[PDB]
């Protein structure tokens, strides 16, 4: 797999949204993979770095929402992202919670992709 950051400058606006999902899913997958290992110093460092990136990306995607023309898609999107964001800051969030976020991000990413191939 190619380094994501290097794809920005050949990416359409929609490909840029997908690249952000790709990155969020990859970080979320890693945080889930090491969730049980967080009593090792490094694994907890890694885990928090990754939840932070997933947060930063999801909070970026929310900030890109056009509620004017986006209409109801915008509003639902905002609603899903806020739940994710609110989960991700839970002190006591669980592995299964993160798994369901992962499932959402993947279903949404695949939608975005379907829209991509129609364009």
């Amino acid at each position: 797999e190619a380094y994501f950051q290097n794809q920005v400058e050949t990416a359409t606006p929609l490909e840029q949204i997908i690249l952000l999902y790709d990155k969020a899913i990859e970080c979320l997958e890693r945080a889930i993979e090491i969730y049980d290992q967080v009593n090792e110093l490094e694994k907890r460092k890694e885990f928090v770095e990754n939840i932070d990136r997933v947060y930063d990306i999801i909070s970026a995607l929310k900030s890109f929402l056009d509620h004017e023309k986006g209409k109801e898609i915008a509003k639902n999107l905002d609603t899903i992202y806020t739940i994710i964001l609110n989960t991700l800051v839970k002190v006591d969030k669980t592995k299964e919670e993160l798994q369901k976020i992962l499932e959402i991000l993947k279903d949404l990413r695949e939608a975005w992709e379907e829209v991509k191939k129609k364009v």
Partner: protein
Amino acid sequence: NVDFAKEMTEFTKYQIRMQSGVAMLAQANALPQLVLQLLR
């Protein structure tokens, strides 16, 4: 909640699939430098 979001998404993914044109106006408004930073 995440269960709620989950239920949303089963619908929302259909909104996007079906209202492409509005999906894009909704979401594809990224500033290129932010994307570059989030992709480090």
